[PDB]
């Protein structure tokens, strides 16, 4: 029996809440998201994942320390069609380390999701996002679509494995 806390960070409008709902509830839309729980198998070991939604408090960058307490993994999401949501990835990463103070922060489990790949007017190149992800101590990068449910399940399988690593270490 193991409980993992995973938070999903990133600017408003990138798809954080949809990524969560798509993963747990396999349902996409278009109010009231808090946190979802899901039982999963990570390399044969049974774990429990607790996904925390921002309840929109990032709209004006007002997420408090309580929100980060004891996070096992931090998902950084951006919109491949909105280059500015990609440039804030560092600021969200820095913030996480500031507020969460994790053990061995230089190796903390960060997973980056380039969302909305189903949209045709992409502005951020796969290579560009991969280079940045690599430069940050080689963190995993997945391109997703909460709308068409592309790569979400697999993306969360890694998020879960990495979350369990941090929780066990």
């Amino acid at each position: 029996k193991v409980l993992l806390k995973v938070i999903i960070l990133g600017d408003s409008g990138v798809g954080k809440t949809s990524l969560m709902n798509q993963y747990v509830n396999k349902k996409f839309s278009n109010i009231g998201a808090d946190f979802l729980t899901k039982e999963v198998m990570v390399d044969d070991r049974l774990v429990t994942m607790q996904i925390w939604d921002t309840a929109g408090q990032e709209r004006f960058q007002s997420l408090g320390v309580a929100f980060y307490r004891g996070a096992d993994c931090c998902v950084l999401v951006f919109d491949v069609t909105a280059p500015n949501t990609f440039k804030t990835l560092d600021s969200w990463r820095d913030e996480f380390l500031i507020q969460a103070s994790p053990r061995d922060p230089e190796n903390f489990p960060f997973v980056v999701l380039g969302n909305k790949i189903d949209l045709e007017n992409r502005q951020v190149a796969t290579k560009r996002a991969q280079a940045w992800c690599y430069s940050k101590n080689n963190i995993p990068y997945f391109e997703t679509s909460a709308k068409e449910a592309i790569n979400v399940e697999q993306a969360f399988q890694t998020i879960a494995r990495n979350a369990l690593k941090q929780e066990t270490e």
Partner: protein, 501 residues
């Protein structure tokens, strides 16, 4: 969108506990809420800080006329907080089993220093509200494991749970009989209205005198079980307190108290989250310059923030610290004496390190008040391993240092580079200490404030008492005026309430 909306139903200024509970309630009921704060963190005077965050907090205490429309006038708001005073900091540990100041800084993030030192009773306004509203899912709790008393000027654990008594022999069997008999009676004093008959008019301490109780037990009950103002509390008030104490026992641990992991500071955020979940919009680092009054109706119409934006609302909730000195010229505040200490040992040493204790030190000289001492261990996630975080509080008399150092001195000994013959028998070491006074704006009548429109409500900061009942009660009272006849923070929807075939 993503541009701050220009109108809401409720605008709340300040993210202290009272304010957050009321914002949660309004949002839960369906009101569009805007919740701002001038600080870069949540809590206001209910906040908690990392060590580095605290030093920054310490520091401090050591554009709209063109927006005023036709037929309006402004009520400027405060632009500088003046609720903290007499800050005194001492670092006894060495600068760089011996914990140096450098270690404190390195592990600073392991600390979560509450500006408010309170505890939760197993049953009470806040805890009952956390369970009912489900805000409880946002926090984890730790049980208080020891109740301590300070008699003869000496520390000692007081047996409470009827079991804890029969596992000790610190009391004669003549006193134990008076105990069970006395406690079992208090647990239901209103069933025997013949024990506090004529004492109704008198105080509690007075009442205890004429009872089948020695002075020792009479002490423990008066200061550790009831814990009420032995002077400012009549017999009823005192008995009622004991009943509360006793009933809360054994519900989670061997005492009636719980403490939130990471500290009291997590509580306002728990409620703010509920507000957000139900639609509340949050803005930290966002001050309001003034209130906009309709000269005709005399109602507050909107606010103007630091950016020059007019934001309309029907109700305005403001925490005391944000009101101008002019709006507060007649208010008579009280003060809270606070002391924060980082120690290398427990006030009462034992094998079992990870203990959370509460010690009560009665006032020695007249004009002073009982001092509440709360000791947190590292597992409470409020301090680094190897240290204890001790909080001292009391209604003010003079300055924080003058009111409390006396007590710190009797319990702790300043760290030094002088090795003693035997440390195990020595008093715990004080590594770092902070003293300060906080304004007490609790129990202040609304009308004490000048010219505030009827649709503008005021929240006080924290009180000097052990619990948060004042934070819940005022919120509840506010909700009754803003949303008449509406369940206060009802439990969120659930598919299990009504079970079908």
């Amino acid at each position: 969108a993503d541009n701050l909306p220009s109108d809401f139903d409720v605008i709340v200024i300040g993210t202290g506990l009272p304010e957050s509970i009321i914002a949660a309630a309004c949002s839960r009921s369906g009101q569009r809420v805007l919740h701002v704060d001038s600080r870069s963190y949540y809590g206001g005077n209910w906040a908690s800080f990392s060590f580095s965050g605290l030093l920054s907090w310490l520091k401090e205490y050591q554009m709209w006329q063109e927006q005023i429309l036709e037929n309006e006038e402004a009520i400027p708001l405060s632009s500088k907080d003046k609720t903290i005073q007499h800050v005194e900091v001492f670092c006894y540990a060495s600068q760089d089993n011996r914990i140096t100041y450098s270690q404190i800084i390195k592990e600073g993030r392991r600390f979560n220093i509450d500006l408010v030192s309170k505890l939760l009773y197993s049953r009470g306004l806040l805890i009952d509200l956390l369970i009912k509203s489900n805000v409880s899912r946002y926090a984890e709790f730790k049980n208080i494991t020891r109740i301590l008393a300070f008699r003869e000027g000496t520390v000692e654990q007081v047996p409470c749970s009827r079991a804890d008594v029969f596992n000790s022999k610190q009391l004669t069997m003549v006193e134990k009989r008076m105990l069970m008999k006395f406690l079992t009676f208090c647990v239901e004093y209103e069933e025997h209205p013949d024990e506090y008959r004529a004492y109704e008019g008198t105080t509690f301490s007075e009442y205890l005198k004429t009872q089948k109780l020695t002075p020792n037990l009479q002490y423990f009950v008066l200061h550790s079980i009831a814990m009420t103002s032995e002077t400012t509390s009549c017999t009823v008030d005192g008995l009622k307190a004991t009943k509360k104490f006793l009933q809360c026992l054994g519900r989670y641990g061997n005492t009636p108290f719980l403490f939130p992991l990471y500290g009291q500071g997590e509580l306002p955020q728990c409620f703010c989250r509920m507000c957000a979940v139900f639609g509340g919009i949050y803005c930290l680092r966002h001050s309001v310059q003034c209130l906009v009054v309709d000269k005709e109706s005399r109602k507050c119409k909107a606010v103007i923030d630091q950016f020059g934006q007019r934001i309309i609302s029907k109700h305005f909730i403001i925490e005391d610290s944000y009101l101008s000195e002019n709006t507060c010229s007649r208010v008579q505040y009280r003060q809270i004496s606070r002391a924060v200490l980082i120690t290398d040992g427990s006030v009462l040493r034992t094998d079992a390190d990870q203990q959370v204790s509460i010690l009560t030190v009665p006032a020695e000289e007249p004009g002073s008040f009982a001092v509440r001492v709360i000791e947190l261990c590292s597992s409470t996630m409020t301090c680094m391993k190897g240290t204890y975080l001790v909080h001292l509080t009391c209604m003010s008399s003079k300055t924080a240092r003058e009111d409390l150092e006396r007590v710190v001195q009797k319990l702790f000994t300043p760290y030094t580079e002088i090795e003693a013959e035997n440390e195990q028998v020595e008093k715990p070491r004080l590594l770092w200490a902070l003293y300060f006074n906080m304004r007490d704006s609790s129990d202040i009548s609304r009308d004490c404030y000048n010219d505030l429109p009827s649709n503008v409500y005021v929240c006080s900061g924290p009180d000097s008492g052990l619990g948060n009942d004042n934070a819940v009660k005022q919120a509840e009272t506010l909700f009754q005026q803003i949303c008449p006849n509406e369940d206060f923070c009802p439990a969120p929807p659930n598919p299990e309430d009504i079970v079908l075939d």
